[PDB]
Amino acid sequence: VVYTLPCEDGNSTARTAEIRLKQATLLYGPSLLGNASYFPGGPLGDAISLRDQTVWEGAAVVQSLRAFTDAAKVAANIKQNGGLNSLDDFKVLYQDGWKGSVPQGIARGQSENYTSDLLFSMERLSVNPYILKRLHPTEDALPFQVDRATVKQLTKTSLKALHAAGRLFVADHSYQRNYTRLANRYSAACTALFYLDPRSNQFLPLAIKTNVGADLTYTPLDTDNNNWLLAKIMFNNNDLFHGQIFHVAYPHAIAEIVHLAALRTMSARHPVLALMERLMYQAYAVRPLGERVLFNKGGLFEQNFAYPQDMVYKFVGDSYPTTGRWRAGYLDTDVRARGLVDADYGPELPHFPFYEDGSRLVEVIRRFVRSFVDATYHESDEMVAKDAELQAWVAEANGPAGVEDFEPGPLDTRERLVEVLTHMAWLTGCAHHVLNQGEPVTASGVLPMHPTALYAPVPTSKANTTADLLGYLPSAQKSVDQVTLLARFNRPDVVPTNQTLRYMFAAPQLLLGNGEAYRRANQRFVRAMGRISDEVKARRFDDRGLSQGMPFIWQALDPGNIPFYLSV
Ligand SMILES: *[C@@H]1O[C@H](CO)[C@@H](O[C@@H]2O[C@H](CO)[C@@H](O)[C@H](O)[C@H]2NC(C)=O)[C@H](O)[C@H]1NC(C)=O
Ligand SMILES: *[C@@H]1O[C@H](CO)[C@@H](O)[C@H](O)[C@H]1NC(C)=O
Ligand SMILES: *[C@@H]1O[C@H](CO)[C@@H](O)[C@H](O)[C@H]1NC(C)=O
Ligand SMILES: [Mn+2]
């Protein structure tokens, strides 16, 4: 199969007949996991979904067996240590364990530095960077009030001064206030307030408000009863839920619907669709299995989290009108819109690890996609504009497929197609793995500070509550169940099978079906991603014990370790 644009194909009546058959058999079926994007239906849509699920099953079985072996080992070791009767006992949950299912190990520094405020705040700029926003001096009010004396001891200034200087930031999970909780499961609905401290030039936590029950406000000065430490725990619990259900819409639902629109309008012979098919490897396995293995009643999610299934579906439906917007989710557009990059109303964040690694990856991807588009369309914008199948795709996405905020048609320049395909590659090869893939087990779901559920009521009092936080955290057993669940979202075999971001474009069918310019661009991409992978693998702590300004080694965007596709 040598790929052809429609005008290059002398076999074109049969080509178009094939596309009309796809259009009769590959339909827009109901959205899965809530009110997001359509899912493939009809006989062909069912067969595509089934094909993907069937391929996915093999690595899922192998990996689950690995995770259960590792789990039995770790549980033996927690038994020899006499259980989990302290916070610092939780290290036994990870020490020398999970070598089979999580061979990259837990992110260094997570367990060792788990009380660090700077770690807690910098996680909002790394492990889940999709909630934080800067507070505009005049267009945003303060999310809540904080004791003036407390603020001044903490900051040597005031909230009005920091707010006016554009140095305040907020991560707001208060939408969880009135969620249903499962019996004997609890959670708050925290709003966390952060600031960029002019003294240390560090992005630091300032206050956490639960927004539930007694609706109390916490601060690093609340050292009594381990209150502040617990508040962070509560926030992380909310935040983990956010990051995992956020990623249902972004990347999964968006990529799925954009690609479904392409499958209905472009030939299998089309170079662009073949590229997209590579990026979307196994993608349509995720939401069906989510319905029946993960989010079912009930159900591994329900067995480890604090909310029932209909709250997951509620969150998806509530967030998709925003998080499903295609152009709004381009890397730069999103971080600028939230005021974290190029903000005119506040100082630049000194360290933003997600944006640093992410923007570099986007540039490497874009160099490849620019060469791909140039070779395919012979350096001609008119050839893009005259590609009837490409234009059919864009109109299908903007119309019957219901893609939100897609690129408006017609799409008449190479540059715009480059933006679209670069963003697809970003979604399947990078963003997915910032939020999901190995990120939870290695960082954002690391116990004790990131439990998937709480096990005692959120305190109604600062003074009259227990100083022992073990009642809220999962037990010795439920910790092993949590780490097992999150370990089953890792896929180590992408490394030995070269199914990683580094080899995203090195597909045999793409190398054979495109010309020599394709191969040369692939070679450049593979080399660049290999160098970035070498750098990420080599990250170490500096003299102050800080990697990328953080008390932990963040390797979630190592191109040599993460899939090129939406693997789980
Ligand atoms: C976070 O925990 C890590 C453990 O990996 C600490 O790492 C050490 O950091 C010092 C510098 O402070 C280095 O000289 C050591 O070589 C590091 N050890 C290892 C095994 O990497 C790190 O200091 C901690 N960071 C903070 C801020 O507490
Ligand atoms: C024309 O396209 C159809 C559909 O793929 C195929 O069966 C036929 O062999 C093609 N003809 C040539 C000469 O490639
Ligand atoms: C993986 O890719 C490298 C090229 O960088 C190659 O040397 C190796 O043989 C490949 N392994 C497999 C299984 O594809
Ligand atoms: Mn996923």
Keywords:
metal ion binding; 19 helices; LipOase_C; monomer; Manganese lipoxygenase; binds a molecule of 2 linked components (NAG-NAG); globular; mainly alpha; secreted; five-stranded antiparallel sheet; 568 residues; binds manganese (II) ion; two-stranded antiparallel ribbon; EC 1.13.11.-; binds 2-acetamido-2-deoxy-beta-D-glucopyranose
- Let me know the largest β-sheet: 5 strands, antiparallel
Strand share of the residues? Answer: under 5%
Number of DSSP E strands: 7
What share of the residues lie within helices? 40-55%
Radius of gyration: 24 Å
Please tally the helical runs, counting DSSP H or I stretches of 4 or more residues.
Answer: 19
User: Rough shape?
Assistant: globular
User: Which ions, cofactors or small ligands are bound in this entry?
Assistant: a molecule of 2 linked components (NAG-NAG), 2-acetamido-2-deoxy-beta-D-glucopyranose, manganese (II) ion
Order of helices and strands: HEEHHEHHEEEEHHHHHHHHHHHHHH
SS class? mainly alpha
Spatial strand sequence of the major β-sheet: 3-4-5-6-7
* Structural domain tally: 1
N/C terminus separation? 29 Å
Chart the SSEs and their pairings.
Elements: H1 12-25, E1 27-29, E2 39-41, H2 42-80, H3 117-122, E3 133-134, H4 148-155, H5 159-164, E4 168-172, E5 191-196, E6 203-209, E7 217-218, H6 227-265, H7 271-279, H8 286-294, H9 300-304, H10 309-323, H11 331-337, H12 353-376, H13 381-385, H14 388-398, H15 414-435, H16 439-444, H17 476-487, H18 508-513, H19 516-537
Antiparallel strand pairs: 1-2, 3-4, 4-5, 5-6, 6-7
Helix pairs in contact: 2-17, 6-10, 6-14, 6-15, 12-15, 12-19
The structure holds a molecule of 2 linked components (NAG-NAG), 2-acetamido-2-deoxy-beta-D-glucopyranose (2 copies) and manganese (II) ion (MN).
PDB class: oxidoreductase
Keywords: oxidase, lipoxygenase
Assembly: monomeric
